Design a protein around this nucleic acid. Sequence first.
DNA 1: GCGCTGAGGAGGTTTCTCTGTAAAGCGCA
DNA 2: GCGCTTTACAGAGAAACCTCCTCAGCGCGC
Length: 254
Amino acid sequence: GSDLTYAYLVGLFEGDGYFSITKKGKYLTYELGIELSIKDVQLIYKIKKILGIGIVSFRKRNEIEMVALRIRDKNHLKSFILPIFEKYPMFSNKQYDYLRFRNALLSGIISLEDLPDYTRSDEPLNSIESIINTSYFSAWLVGFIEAEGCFSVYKLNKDDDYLIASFDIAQRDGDILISAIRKYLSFTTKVYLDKTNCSKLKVTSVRSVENIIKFLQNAPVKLLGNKKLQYLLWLKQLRKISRYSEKIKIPSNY
DNA sequence: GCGCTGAGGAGGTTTCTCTGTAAAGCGCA
DNA sequence: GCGCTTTACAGAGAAACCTCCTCAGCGCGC
Ligand SMILES: [Mg+2]
Ligand SMILES: [Mg+2]
Ligand SMILES: [Mg+2]
């Protein structure tokens, strides 16, 4: 779909993918990969359908089932992948990976010896304002949600029937990123920093739940895979929790 | 024959997802 | 000292992420 479905794909690749250059005996593998749960096989084929390229693979890691999409053909990466990531840049320090990948690829580095040593900085490239004000952000955000968002419902206490209903999203070395999301979506809950510099944003209130629901109705593109399914079953649950349904215009198709 | 390729395959570590627990603010009594 | 509702904090492990190898086969020219 859309031109901004490509922006959605960069968000999804930012959340769940990886750029990598790996030794291959005497030479190199340049790759862009995403490996998802088998719950997401249909989305893997929607991604290949959008890009027109990429090898699909299955893995059983002995009881967890996994699907990958991997682009390794260097002419295809130069032609089709870099431009997407030029036109719609990643917002986080995963941009450092695209920049080293792009520089290596375009310089024609083919041996480990000529490959510059890479350590990905923890320091952000953008500000809140710079993230929030770019034209493609909301479309990026649907894919980043596709990758990293969580919609859940849970009992507040074992003994009662009081249900919570939360949306939560996290990123390591992601103060700015996550705060930008908080800002844009008018969330006011405190971002939590854990032992491993992973910033975590979680919301529960009626108004915040009303805010993400409204953002995803009005966003340029929609959720496509298993998060889309998680989104609909959450909504299902939401229609039967009084505080939410008697204050939110919930449903739709999608 | 030779330099180099990527599909197909797989070993290794950890960031997110998902679901809370404990504590409390609001308002009413 | 109680319904209802929200939030600061955080743990487990599945779902992400990161890394390397073999071997047909290609596109040249000795
Ligand atoms: Mg991620
Ligand atoms: Mg992730
Ligand atoms: Mg994910």
